[PDB]
Design a protein around this ligand. Sequence first.
Ligand code: NI
Length: 186
Amino acid sequence: SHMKREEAIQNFKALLSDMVRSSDVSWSDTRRTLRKDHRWESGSLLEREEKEKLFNEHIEALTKKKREHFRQLLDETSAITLTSTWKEVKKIIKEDPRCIKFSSSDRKKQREFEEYIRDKYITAKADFRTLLKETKFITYRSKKLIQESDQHLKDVEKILQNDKRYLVLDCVPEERRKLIVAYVDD
Ligand code: NI
């Protein structure tokens, strides 16, 4: 009968999968309402602690899934730029279930948006450093050259100007220039 406890876990898990679709809900509320469902007794072998554990894992799973689909939706919205605001973006994606079902909380959507943009920014810098390492007009002597005059940095920016990786940073001009400077230093 050892498998009976394992069977109860899977039963309780199926109950959660069926009845809890939102990551916003509390265990307190959920254990209240699920108790009204006759399927609840099928978890009798499970102590409240392990039920609550299973609930937490479930919320964790929903959270991960929703975040991934949210980010996919953002990745699919081509109007988004490094400088886009949640306020602007919300207007575009408002009807998409991946936005709607992410959470009832605007704060949590906004926060996930700002985190997405941060990651997007981080990824773009990494790619840009790759491009920089590819460019052999940029040498140990570049730093000499940069301190002597405006020219070298302009010459560099000319060579880089048409590359996909340089251009995705158009929204953060000062930042990009710093990256070039940083690479010229090291
Ligand atoms: Ni047995």
